[model samples]
Target: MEKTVIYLLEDGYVDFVVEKIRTKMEKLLEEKDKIFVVLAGGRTPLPVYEKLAEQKFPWNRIHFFLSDERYVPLDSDQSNFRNINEVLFSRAKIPSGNVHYVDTSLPIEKACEKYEREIRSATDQFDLAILGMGPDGHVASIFDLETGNKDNLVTFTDPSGDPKVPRVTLTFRALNTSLYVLFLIRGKEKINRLTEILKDTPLPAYFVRGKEKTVWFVGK
Candidate 1:
């Protein structure tokens, strides 16, 4: 199914993209009693978090979660939780208790179970989830053709053949449950995969479109 509404931004800068998302998020929150947001990790999303941190939204009413995370120490440079903390949560008035993070320091299987329990306890189904697609056509950490069909909510794999560390990702089953799913595409390299995703290819991102609402925000 053609399941997404596409928005082409005027430019690729963080400010423009954040404004677009903030306006939408604010509107959605204002119309609903609770707003739960699942965030994606990438350089492109950093600025959006920075902008969100300064907004006057009701921080207490917001619940924050991550789309996926790397299996590294929480303080590691690669940790998505650390990125969100540094860029957004630290600057915002959001209660410390409202931030639900993936415990990347634990064993991969245990970490996934912990995260799922946290998500199940913190709030109902997510109101919105923001995502980014890798150049390799991966979304979240669900990379490559081989791992796409994995049914677990979170799974660990050495898709890149790195021994010291493997990737942990929220499966398509988890990501697709959100009420609204937004995919932010910046840079020219994403256009082709964006097209493929729109065509309903088996990319992990394609699962998001089957949700109640989905959008692809692209910037040239």
Candidate 2:
């Protein structure tokens, strides 16, 4: 089992998370020719992503993928890729080919298939995954109550959570393949729920684990 570590910070959580990510990214890049990272989207992780974009790194050597995406036009404001791009991708030196995103124009099934193919071609297991938890304890469009497809690398889900739009997401099977999992969670409600999850609540976020370690950066 992977070890679990939690950081409950009262302030400067964004910088703390950014530093942690940078530290890991630097170490991983030194060890591997290239590294794959799965990133979370939403309001919660946006600040962290924005701050992270300001740091210096070999962006071209680090491939980035989204944990989940809404079935909206890529340019739409609701699109996770669009939001993340505005903050990180737009500011960083990452190449287009290094960013893997779902094609919302295609059918959900086709989009999932294409994304899965791209991810598989890149790496069987991601080196790192940064996730954000919903108030309901959902992660990566995988709701707390949903029984996602275990055999697939990526799957679709019905409208759930905030924007209430259809979504294509990496399945637990895929996310669990990461060597490190970092959860950037904030707010009092979600933080409390996380504690409950640790006590064995079986929430969707609770099931995601890194092969080596899982760390939660809880901010207030």
Candidate 3:
């Protein structure tokens, strides 16, 4: 069963999200040996990750995965892993083996296959997933209400949105396996589109629900 929660905050949004993430991870760690967390790329969630990095969680027990990655060199400006490394990994003591990313050097299809294998070897269900929605209401690289095989854990999509490079992303089956899904939406434009999402618009983001709970944290 999936439970949905929404928090529309006019203030202290970043701190609140950081605390929520911390509380959840801490609690999950008590009962599990390792936890898998899927992280989003882009600016909105960087502050949350930055603040979360300051906490004293058991970093080694937590595994990190990108929800999506631009099919560019790992060090490219468009690389999600590059930004995340600077903000979170650099500050925290997370090991290289615990961080999984797409190898853009391979063909896009091969990259997806490699990522899917990496994820499966670790665990099928993610402990938590934090995602940021695009202005067009796309989550990860699954865009524009498009659909694909839910069984395909990872897949590639043609260029969409900013940076406009091809992408390798976890499919619905992969994301929905999470115990928690967190959507952090910031900026006026994206916030304004929240109503359409509430009215049950068939946007891509709308479908990515966690098996346990899906929480949306919105800011103005």
Candidate 4:
């Protein structure tokens, strides 16, 4: 099994964490003519994304997609895309066409098919994915082995174990195709689950094996 590296940050200090993510962004942008970046929604990555807004980046060269999204109204507070919109895409000068959002307007089943089509149109590989975990160890809406095993590039997840509304997410097919995967997580409450991951227990997050690299950035 590929080992995931851990970066432990000092309590309440997010400076290094923010810089680490932006630095990866900058590095990838330089190496590729066009880059694909997958992002996760939640309060954990919001601070890093907000900090990212301070720097000017070639947003046109980067194609963005959400790791997962709540099955909710586009305008709803629970919508993960909306969470990032307020901090990143909405404020940044990114090309509107470059950010691929799952069509929440469509019925759940149709939305799943449409999202994979969008994934294919963008790039062959996912390039980089930044994902988060729920309290129960779910990642990107995936609640179990079955949810992670979707044949398509993207799929739907209805996890009764989690409080998050049933949602659509990039399946392991799309997610694991990444050259790099970053798990940007936070809070002392998560340490137990994080430890479980290090021990290679059966968590949904553990199934997301990146092609090249996987790193965990944890701050409390």
- Select the stronger candidate by TM-score from 3 and 4: 3
Task: Write one digit per residue (lDDT tens) for candidate 3, span 143-216.
Answer: 74443344689989888778887888988888889989999998788876667878998778878888889999
lDDT string for model 4 (1-220, tens) is: 6657888887654577777777888988888889898998877888878887677888889889998888888888888888899999898889999999878899998988888888898889977898888777878878777888888888887744444467898877788998888887777667678888779888888878678789888775
Off by over 4 Å in 3: 147-150
Q: What pairs collide in candidate 3?
A: none
Rate residue 14 of model 4 by lDDT: 59
TM-score ranking of the models: 2, 3, 4, 1
Model 1, span 17-90: residue lDDT tens = 67877887888887987788889888777778888899888899898988877777889887788988998988
Using TM-score as the yardstick, the better of models 2 and 4 is 2
For every candidate structure, what is the RMSD over all alpha carbons to the true structure, in angstroms?
Answer: 2.5, 1.2, 1.3, 1.8
Best by TM-score: 2
Task: Give the CA lDDT, 0 to 100, for residue 27 in model 3.
Answer: 92
How does each model score on lDDT?
Answer: 0.77, 0.90, 0.89, 0.82
Candidate No. with top lDDT? 2
Model 1 regions lying over 4 Å from their true place:
145-148, 159-164
Candidate 3 residue-wise lDDT at 177: 90
